[PDB]
Design a protein around this ligand. Structure first.
Ligand code: FDA
Ligand code: GRG
Ligand code: GRG
Ligand code: GRG
Length: 452
């Protein structure tokens, strides 16, 4: 078989892989990125396509321009199940043409020295002496099977986790996730018959009956075009999401023209803390493959880009030291936990609480102003549930005259506090990973039982 030598092999060219490629470019490294999809389809996984502007501003990723930016976003309207209470959170963001932006990032990375092979699948790892050392690839453009050696593989295969899942199962980098720690989500993009009211605002609709464990959404892509969809929690035995969509679409999108559909599709999305380690010998995992998605609102394009930024940093450091061991690449973990992972862990707890609340609970809490709509924004910043907020919330619901899980909010805050402390003390080396992990698992196990 043909054998090639690269510094870095990036597997997957979505927001995660393309960010890593972009952030590693113009540095004199020999980099190959591969994706199973043809070029003009790269980036087209079903998504609501909404990304906060802050992520581009902090990472130095290109702003979306032209046909890439479908609609400027100025905030989000959050709807109670009975739709009688709406909370507004203001903030700048973009409704993207995801494939068009994604492909432009890749083409610029390519112009900046990164080699790209589309229609190419990494079929199996090269693994020897405890190290990932590359991949066997099948290039369906050339109908060639190729062996590529790399100092580091960047695993950016999305939810498929189609490379790291083929590594020896004893390795931390092969960590799987519980079925209940992901959503299935489905969306369509449609034209609308009436102008879209406040089209610069996303709409998110909480409802445990029409989207159990997730939510419905209505994300305008223009004055007369909307991305509408829902996500529901996995591992709960729920019926087909396509059947939820058909049944309740009219509730959330009565204005759409069902004859003018531009795109439709679904996929899985992780909703948990990240991989306990995103680094091992000769490999870093990023994006959905590394469980980088915000457990509460399900947004992962922004955090995918953050994970690509951290990966590039750790890899550049590893080429300085010559150390591509787990230890040599460990800054991946330190960087990612700092930038988003600790926040995710806190929100992993909070998610579990939200998914157990009833519609009556959520209607009541929102109507009684259990929190300010402004406290929502502060909490979303680092995923913190502060004392004064929790205490006030408890006083607000103190008149409620039925059993409710809302009264567990104080204990939720306590568990969030516990897990945040653990992530603030992320293991400085691989040799501490195991005992730290068991501490985190114990916090989660104790929390689960508290809600049962
Ligand atoms: C319906 C729906 C809606 C939303 C969202 C998800 C879903 C399903 N999310 C989440 C967000 O879309 C998601 O977190 C990111 O797109 C993940 O990007 P990645 O690059 O990690 O994976 P992604 O799956 O995008 O890319 C993985 C790539 O790897 C390739 N690949 C896989 N295995 C391979 C192999 N062995 N060899 C070669 N290539 C391989 C695939 O071809 C693919 O291009 C979201 N996020 C957000 O911020 N805003 C939102 O609006 C939403 N809404
Ligand atoms: C549909 C699924 C599965 C996920 C969606 C993921 C989401 C909700 C993405 C929204 C991203 C977006 C457009 C955010 C902009 C709106 C907003 C409130 C941004 C807040 O960011 P900040 O910059 O911190 O706010 P400020 O500008 O007020 O400081
Ligand atoms: C999961 C269930 C049961 C309900 C939905 C969960 C909720 C309350 C979502 C609220 C949406 C919200 C207020 C999002 C915050 C704004 C935002 C997207 C900021 C930017 O995103 P980051 O990437 O976190 O930065
Ligand atoms: C709205 C209901 C039913 C209860 C309010 C419950 C509380 C105290 C919410 C504030 C705690 C918190 C962490 C909110 C932000 C969650 C979020 C939007 C994360 C996105 O990142």
């Amino acid at each position: 078989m043909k054998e090639l030598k690269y510094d870095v092999l990036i597997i997957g060219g979505g927001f995660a892989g393309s960010s890593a490629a972009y952030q590693l470019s113009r540095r004199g490294l020999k980099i190959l990125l591969v994706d199973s999809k043809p070029w003009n389809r790269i980036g087209d996984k079903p998504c609501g396509d909404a990304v906060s502007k802050a992520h581009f501003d902090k990472l130095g990723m290109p702003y979306p321009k032209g046909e890439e930016l479908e609609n400027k976003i100025n905030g989000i309207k959050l709807y109670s199940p009975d739709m009688q209470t709406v909370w507004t959170v203001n903030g700048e963001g973009f409704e993207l043409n995801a494939p068009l932006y994604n492909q432009r990032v890749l083409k610029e990375a390519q112009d900046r020295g990164v080699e790209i092979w589309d229609l190419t699948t990494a079929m199996k790892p090269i693994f020897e002496d405890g190290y990932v050392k590359g991949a066997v690839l099948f290039n369906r453009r050339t109908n060639e099977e190729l062996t590529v050696y790399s100092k580091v593989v960047v695993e950016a295969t999305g939810y498929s986790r189609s490379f790291r899942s083929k590594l020896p199962p004893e390795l931390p980098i092969t960590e799987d996730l519980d079925d209940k720690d992901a959503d299935v989500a489905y969306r369509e993009v449609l034209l609308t018959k009436e102008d879209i009211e406040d089209h610069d605002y996303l709409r998110i609709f909480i409802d445990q009956e029409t989207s159990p464990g997730g939510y419905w959404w209505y994300f305008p892509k223009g004055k007369n075009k909307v991305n509408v969809g829902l996500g529901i929690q996995g591992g709960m035995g729920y019926p087909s999401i396509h059947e939820y969509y058909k049944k309740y679409l009219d509730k959330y999108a009565p204005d759409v023209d069902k004859s003018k559909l531009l795109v439709k599709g679904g996929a899985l999305v992780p909703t948990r803390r990240p991989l306990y380690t995103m680094a091992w010998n000769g490999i870093i995992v990023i994006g959905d493959s590394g469980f980088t998605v915000n457990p509460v609102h399900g947004g992962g394009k922004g955090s995918a880009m953050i994970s690509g930024y951290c990966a590039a940093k750790a890899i550049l450091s590893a080429f300085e030291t010559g150390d591509f061991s787990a230890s040599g690449l460990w800054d991946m973990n330190i960087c990612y936990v700092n930038e988003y992972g600790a926040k995710q862990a806190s929100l992993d707890i909070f998610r579990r609480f939200l998914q157990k609340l009833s519609n009556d609970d959520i209607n009541y809490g929102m109507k009684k102003k259990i929190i300010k709509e402004e406290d929502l924004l502060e909490a979303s910043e680092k995923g913190d549930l502060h004392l004064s907020v929790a205490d006030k919330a408890m006083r607000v619901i103190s008149g409620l005259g039925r059993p409710s899980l809302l009264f567990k909010l104080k204990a939720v805050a306590e568990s969030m506090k516990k897990i945040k402390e653990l992530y603030l003390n992320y293991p400085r080396s691989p040799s501490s990973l195991g005992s730290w992990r068991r501490e985190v698992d114990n916090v989660l196990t104790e929390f689960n039982k508290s809600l049962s």
